[PDB]
């Protein structure tokens, strides 16, 4: 039943290996959408059950961003300016391209 975190962790390494080996492919990998959905559901713990995870959230963000340089990955970002301009000018970078470009 509950088998999403391990599947996402296994798909992240395979996606990273495929991106490091093949740099011209840019199609859907069937299970890529499911892995992205699982990573998003695991990272949205603070919105689902209000979890204050740090190392797990960082690992999930790293696994979601390591495969974004080959496929598409439309989501996977941060959380607006509600935590960046009210905590210490530091709230996990994400869409630096969209922030510094148009």
């Amino acid at each position: 039943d509950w088998e999403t975190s391990g599947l996402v962790y296994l798909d992240y390494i395979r996606v990273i290996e495929m991106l490091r080996h093949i740099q011209q492919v840019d199609c859907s990998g069937n299970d890529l959408e499911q892995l992205h959905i699982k990573v998003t559901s695991l990272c949205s713990r603070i919105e689902q059950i209000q979890c204050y995870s740090a190392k797990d959230r960082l690992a999930q963000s790293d696994m979601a961003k390591r495969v974004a340089n080959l496929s598409t990955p439309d989501p996977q970002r941060v959380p607006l300016r509600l935590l960046a301009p009210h905590i210490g000018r530091l709230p996990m970078p994400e869409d630096y391209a969209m922030d510094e470009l148009r």
């Binding site: 991106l19 740099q23 011209q24 840019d26 340089n69 080959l70 496929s71 598409t72």
Partner: protein, 119 residues
């Protein structure tokens, strides 16, 4: 009249010319009365001539067309590298938006893999 035009374009590109070779490649691509499966040799030569010359913004049309028919991403990557090295930062960013999304993503992924950082 296609083989002679291709040979003339290759001889002009191997010498040092750029406009004459591009014109010969365009003429050979326009006059293609064979309609065979070996039409990729002229398209690759035209793409190479457009990447070596540039000037106008018509070089992005052949790269997005040669990569959408088959899996010839090497020519598109070489053209993108030539356009980036030919000092065209304000022109190659706007020409890539008019192409496909998958080809642009592939070109970005191929260009981001750089293990040598210079000036």
């Amino acid at each position: 009249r296609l083989q002679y035009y291709d040979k003339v374009l290759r001889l002009l590109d191997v010498i040092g010319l750029p406009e004459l070779v591009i014109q010969l490649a365009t003429s050979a691509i326009t006059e293609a009365g064979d309609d065979w499966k070996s039409q990729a040799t002229l398209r690759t030569c035209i793409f190479k001539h457009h990447l070596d010359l540039g000037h106008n913004s018509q070089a992005y049309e052949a790269l997005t067309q040669i990569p959408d028919s088959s899996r010839q991403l090497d020519c598109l990557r070489q053209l993108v590298v030539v356009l980036c090295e030919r000092s065209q930062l304000q022109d190659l960013v706007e020409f890539p938006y008019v192409n496909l999304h998958n080809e642009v993503v592939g070109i970005i992924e191929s260009r981001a893999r750089a293990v040598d950082l210079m000036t």
